[PDB]
Write a protein that binds this ligand. Sequence first.
Ligand code: 0OW
Ligand code: NMN
Length: 313
Amino acid sequence: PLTLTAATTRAQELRKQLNQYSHEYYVKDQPSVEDYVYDRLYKELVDIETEFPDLITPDSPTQRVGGKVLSGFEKAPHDIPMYSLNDGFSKEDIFAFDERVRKAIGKPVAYCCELKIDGLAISLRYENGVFVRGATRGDGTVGENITENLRTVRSVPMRLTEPISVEVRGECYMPKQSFVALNEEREENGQDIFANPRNAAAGSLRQLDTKIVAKRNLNTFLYTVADFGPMKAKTQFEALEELSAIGFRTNPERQLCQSIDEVWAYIEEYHEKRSTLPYEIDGIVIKVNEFALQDELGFTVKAPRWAIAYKFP
Ligand SMILES: NC(=O)c1c(N)nc(OC2CCCC2)nc1O[C@@H]1CCC[C@@H]1O
Ligand SMILES: NC(=O)c1ccc[n+]([C@@H]2O[C@H](COP(=O)(O)O)[C@@H](O)[C@H]2O)c1
C-alpha cells in the first residue's frame, strides 16, 4: 500500500492543494472545483492521516474540526492596544468629525469607509507565516487567548501565502442564517436562544470545547494591521487590499471617499442596503485614509482621533 516515505510527501501535496481550494471557497467566497473533488482528496488525506497520525500538521484541513478541550483561556496581552471607536449618530456628528480633522490637519482629507461588522473583534498573530495566536480584544490591553477556537474558523488561514510575521485585527461574526439555524437547534435542545448574532458569535468563541466551536459557522473580515512587519500599505484602503493579498477575508463593501459629502453618500447607500446583507452591521466606520495623517491626529486614551463610527439607530 502506502509507505511512510510516500505518505509524508503525498500529504503535503494534499494539504497544499486542499488548503488552496478552501481558500477560494472560504476566503474569496468563490470555489473553483466541485465539492466532490474536494471531498475525495480530503478523504484521501484523512486516510493517510489515520494510518500515520504523525503526519498531522496544524495547517492541515482535517484539523478544522477541532477536538481539543481547554480548562480556561490564558490572558492575551496586546503590546499594541486594541482601541475602541468614537461614536456619531447624526449628519452633524459626522460633519463635525470632518470639521475637526481638517482643523488639525489643515486641508481636505480622504476617508476610507468600511461597514462596522456586528460581531467579536479579534487579533491574529503570524510568525514566518504560521498562525500562533488568536485573541479577543478584552479590555483593549488584555484579551483572552482563543487560538484553539479560531483554528476552527475556516476563513482564518493556518498558514499564509508568504512566510511573513504580522499581526492583524478584525471581526469574527456569525452570518444571519447560521444565527437562525443555531437558534432553532437551541430551541430543539431546550436551551436559551441567543438574542442576536453578535451574542452567538461571542458565546461560540467562549466555548472551551473546540469541537462545538467548529460546528458554529463563524466567519471573519480583517480590516486592520496592528503589526505591519514587512508590510507596505501606506493608506487604509491600501491595507485592505494587502490583507487580501496575503490571504485574509476582507469585506468588499469598503469605499474610498475624497470628501465628507461622499462619506455621507456611502452611509446612506448601505443604510438602505443594510438588510440585503448576509451579516449584521450596526453602522459605518469612517477612517482617515493616509496613515501619515492617522499618525498626526493620533489617539485619545479610548479611541483613535482619525476614525469614528456612524451607528445606525
Ligand atoms: N467592527 C468593524 O467593522 C470595525 C472596523 N471595520 N474597523 C475598525 O477600526 C478600528 C480598529 C482600531 C481603531 C479603529 N473597528 C471596527 O470595530 C471596532 C473593533 C473593536 C471595537 C469596534 O467594534
Ligand atoms: N473548493 C471547494 O469546493 C470547497 C472547499 C472547502 C470546503 N468545501 C465544502 O465545505 C464542506 C465542509 O468542508 P471543511 O469542514 O473541510 O471545510 C464540505 O461539504 C466541502 O465539500 C468545498
